[PDB]
Design a protein around this ligand. Structure first.
Ligand SMILES: *[C@@H]1O[C@H](CO)[C@@H](O[C@@H]2O[C@H](CO)[C@@H](O[C@@H]3O[C@H](CO)[C@@H](O)[C@H](O[C@H]4O[C@H](CO)[C@@H](O)[C@H](O)[C@@H]4O)[C@@H]3O)[C@H](O)[C@H]2NC(C)=O)[C@H](O)[C@H]1NC(C)=O
Ligand SMILES: *[C@@H]1O[C@H](CO)[C@@H](O[C@@H]2O[C@H](CO)[C@@H](O[C@@H]3O[C@H](CO)[C@@H](O)[C@H](O)[C@@H]3O)[C@H](O)[C@H]2NC(C)=O)[C@H](O)[C@H]1NC(C)=O
Ligand SMILES: *[C@@H]1O[C@H](CO[C@@H]2O[C@@H](C)[C@@H](O)[C@@H](O)[C@@H]2O)[C@@H](O[C@@H]2O[C@H](CO)[C@@H](O)[C@H](O)[C@H]2NC(C)=O)[C@H](O)[C@H]1NC(C)=O
Ligand SMILES: *[C@@H]1O[C@H](CO[C@@H]2O[C@@H](C)[C@@H](O)[C@@H](O)[C@@H]2O)[C@@H](O)[C@H](O)[C@H]1NC(C)=O
Ligand SMILES: *[C@@H]1O[C@H](CO)[C@@H](O)[C@H](O)[C@H]1NC(C)=O
Ligand SMILES: *[C@@H]1O[C@H](CO)[C@@H](O)[C@H](O)[C@H]1NC(C)=O
Ligand SMILES: *[C@@H]1O[C@H](CO)[C@@H](O)[C@H](O)[C@H]1NC(C)=O
Ligand SMILES: *[C@@H]1O[C@H](CO)[C@@H](O)[C@H](O)[C@H]1NC(C)=O
Ligand SMILES: *[C@@H]1O[C@H](CO)[C@@H](O)[C@H](O)[C@H]1NC(C)=O
Ligand SMILES: [Ca+2]
Ligand SMILES: [Ca+2]
Lengths: 422, 446
């Protein structure tokens, strides 16, 4: 029927092959939250006891889930990672939402019970059934305008990386120095901006490569049951590993691009294209002859089996059939290719501005808070984060909270399918 | 025994249909998640050796198209159909048995037959959007343009940023500069003055509806371009007009949609909290109580002045001002002082989205007769592949190296695309007639 129409359409091209995976954005895409209820009396008690041995929110999770229904309807499933706690309002009868406990994902149960968000965020990529590319949100992060997968990833330019300038006041600044040193030690020194406070798309395969590259440091982050100065940063480590990981060129794939006839043997014309790849222009005759003599030299030295339909005519009658095996095993040639194309990024990425991110630090100046929120009302942003820095000692703290509620209810007044009928 | 069960198995078509509804909304967003398809390619091709052609002009190559079609098979395999627009001429090598390629004659697309026969590409380019069966978004190439790297529909268009526009700095030598001047005047008069760059020499994606809107905007000038059987200084430039119409066409804001965005509960009446958002949209921040009350008074005055049927309960809405009427959609739309400040606060909005692009992926080379410079130009493409390649023929046949330069090009073409395409007849075979009219008559007679 109409299902047959779509399946036939993507093959309706000169190649007769479907390119739907390239023409369409990656799906599925799941969402992962981490959530905690700080009013839980058992939790408060167990935290302080650990502090001796070594708090109500703004219902951000609720409103963030409304922002998904409104602005990210393409999301498949929503995982809420907790210690076992479940929000009272959560409608777990809805199959689209589920709760994953720290036990379900943590590798060393002795690290649990945990009270460290970086430790949890070390294992959120281990959620069973999680989509290869998922989007991780802190509950204070939400969508303020319609978003699409292309706001996080494109096929041509890879993942989008939203970078901001660090703040010296950040408590994670010690953690940034610890991660910066590990990254400088691994890839060389660079000055690094910090990923913006926003929903982060994470690729499970890349994340595991990052954690396999620094296995002890992620285990050390997981083992700290409270935030530590030597913790690995979720967004900072991932996005800079994505941008720093290098890969060497695959010679056999370089060969195939040169071997435009797909014969498996490089003609003189194709050898020339190889010559331009490893030599500066203009090309000299000797650049070409030296490349030729490298192939002739290598054919004699290399064993016959490694060197391996139609005979090829060469200007030099001494020229052997320039087979793939010969080019790959000819180190003088492969080394100059790698020299010409120095170690290159394994992954594609696109640096982005902060234009679509609206980060506000909510203190207790009521008139300042109304001024901050009125800015979001006037100029909508795709990614909004109202960071709760309210001081309960101050008298106007309750007023500021009522202003946030007024703002949240102005933007997302409709209950979502994840709130119980109530 | 006996018992039956519903089928767990889903064909890959049901798998795809189910996957696109597998989201919190239960709705398919495939049109937004996937690039627009189908996408066709359109060429213009002419054979200069044709004696009938040489005759009609006076009375008034490197087989690049072959290699360009090879570049599509290698680098743009997603293309649905390839239309070749001719005066009637049929390439000898073209395999008209392939249903992917077809030959369209100027008669099929031109509106006034008296303009034909034509010898002006700007005239033909005026009607290529009239091809029957053409995809709404298509890619128009001259035969000298080819793909030198893997290309994809997102190299021309995205859902988020609209069509990509590749602009270059104008060249005073270019012959179309007189045409550029003529078009610039019409554009200045229609959209106001802007300084305008020229679209690069490359494949151009055209939307048939946008192109028709452009030609509906300047109907006499495209008829005048069509009427000129040879290129003229008052000819409309194909790419320059389309892309600057796309970027300049403005759309007036839809006030009811602004209302709907502010009406976040969808109740149809703006609450006080929703009104505050509208106040920030039309006032500079910070928002003073004067700014808010001013908007509150504009709504109060309008409910009195306007007809009661235009101002128009699901829920009782409580306002800070007891004088505040229910702020309905009709009240906000008809209230001139509000909509004026709305339209002032939001500048005139481009009807179409677009993305300005650099020229990095475009490799435009003008081939003269200096062999050394040509080999250097071609070696630059061999060393640094580019998505869009244009090798413009400016070779002088008088020069002795002309035959050599022509041999270097075909060597470069063969080095990049040695495999024959599905659109080429075998080398030994050849279409019997070089004109469609000869082929049409011969098949009626059989
Ligand atoms: C975060 O943790 C806090 C602390 O654990 C938690 O607050 C507690 O919530 C429960 C309900 O979720 C409260 O219990 C209520 O108590 C009142 C009287 O004090 C009762 O009237 C309520 O009864 C209703 O609900 C019952 C259960 O369905 C029904 O059987 C009954 O008929 C009524 O309909 C209810 O039992 C408890 O008092 C608070 N305690 C504190 C200290 O706040 C909070 O819910 C957690 N937040 C989230 C988002 O999960
Ligand atoms: C572009 O146009 C030219 C001219 O129309 C095409 O070449 C011409 O092709 C015709 C048909 O094959 C040739 O006619 C043949 O002539 C030979 C020798 O006179 C004769 O033995 C055959 O029986 C037939 O009559 C014609 O000679 C030839 N002319 C020239 C100058 O080459 C050419 O094929 C066209 N190219 C494309 C790509 O369509
Ligand atoms: C269709 O075109 C004819 C011809 O237009 C002329 O010839 C073209 C090749 C080109 O050179 C044009 O600039 C010419 O104007 C139109 O017939 C002309 O009509 C006008 C107005 O009645 C008259 O002054 C001319 O003498 C006519 N010329 C001829 C050759 O008939 C015709 O009106 C056009 N019709 C439509 C619907 O576009
Ligand atoms: C699992 O963890 C065990 C305990 O490690 C200790 O406790 C944790 C909570 C941290 O405080 C850590 O600093 C302590 O060293 C280890 O003894 C055990 O080896 C770990 N398991 C594995 C397989 O490594
Ligand atoms: C290199 O590419 C070829 C195919 O082009 C593939 O078979 C091979 O596994 C690749 N090798 C590496 C190391 O990626
Ligand atoms: C080839 O081998 C000879 C002898 O070992 C050596 O002198 C020459 O420099 C070599 N050339 C290349 C290109 O490897
Ligand atoms: C913060 O409060 C002070 C008075 O307490 C006021 O002057 C100021 O306007 C407020 N902040 C801003 C940014 O307006
Ligand atoms: C504005 O949008 C509404 C809702 O889709 C529609 O009914 C109305 O015709 C639109 N108005 C204009 C001028 O486009
Ligand atoms: C041809 O080009 C080369 C390289 O740019 C230059 O050195 C040479 O002088 C040119 N010769 C002529 C006749 O233009
Ligand atoms: Ca070969
Ligand atoms: Ca409302």
């Amino acid at each position: 029927d109409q299902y047959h129409v779509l399946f036939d359409s993507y093959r309706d091209n000169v190649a007769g092959k479907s390119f739907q995976t390239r023409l369409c954005l990656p799906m599925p895409i799941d969402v992962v939250y981490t959530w905690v209820n700080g009013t839980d009396p058992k939790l408060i008690k167990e935290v302080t006891e650990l502090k001796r041995s070594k708090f109500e929110d703004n219902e951000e999770l609720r409103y963030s889930l409304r922002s998904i229904e409104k602005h990210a309807p393409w999301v498949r499933h929503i995982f809420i990672v907790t210690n076992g706690q479940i929000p009272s309002w959560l409608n777990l009868d809805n199959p689209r939402v589920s709760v994953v406990t720290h036990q379900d994902i943590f590798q060393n149960q002795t690290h649990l019970p945990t009270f460290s968000s970086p430790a949890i965020e070390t294992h959120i990529h281990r959620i069973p059934g999680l989509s290869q590319k998922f989007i991780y949100l802190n509950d204070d992060v939400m969508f303020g305008k319609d978003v699409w997968p292309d706001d996080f990833y494109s096929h041509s330019k890879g993942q989008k990386v939203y970078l901001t300038w660090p703040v010296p006041n950040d408590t994670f600044a010690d953690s940034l120095r610890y991660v910066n040193r590990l990254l400088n030690a691994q890839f060389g020194f660079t000055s690094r901006k910090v990923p913006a406070h926003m929903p982060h798309m994470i690729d499970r395969l890349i994340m595991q490569e990052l954690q396999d590259t620094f296995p002890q440091e992620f285990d050390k982050t997981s083992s700290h049951r409270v935030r530590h100065s030597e913790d690995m940063q979720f967004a900072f480590s991932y996005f800079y590993f994505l941008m720093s990981a290098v890969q060497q060129l695959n010679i056999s794939e370089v060969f195939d691009e040169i071997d435009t006839d797909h014969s498996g043997v490089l003609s003189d014309r194709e050898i020339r294209t190889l010559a331009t790849r490893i030599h500066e222009l203009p090309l000299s005759l000797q650049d070409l002859t030296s490349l030729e003599q490298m192939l002739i030299n290598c054919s004699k030295s290399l064993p016959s089996n490694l060197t391996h339909p139609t005979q090829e005519a060469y200007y030099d009658p001494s020229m052997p059939p320039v087979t793939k095996g010969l080019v790959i095993h000819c180190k003088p040639i492969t080394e100059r290719i790698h020299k010409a194309f120095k170690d290159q990024n394994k992954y594609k990425f696109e640096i982005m501005g902060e234009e679509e991110i609206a980060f506000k630090m909510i203190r207790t100046n009521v008139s300042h808070v109304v001024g901050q929120l009125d800015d979001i009302r006037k100029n909508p942003r795709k990614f909004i984060c109202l960071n709760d820095n309210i001081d309960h000692i101050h008298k106007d703290a309750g007023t500021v909270k009522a202003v946030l509620r007024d703002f949240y209810e102005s933007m997302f007044p409709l209950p979502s399918q994840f709130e119980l009928p109530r």
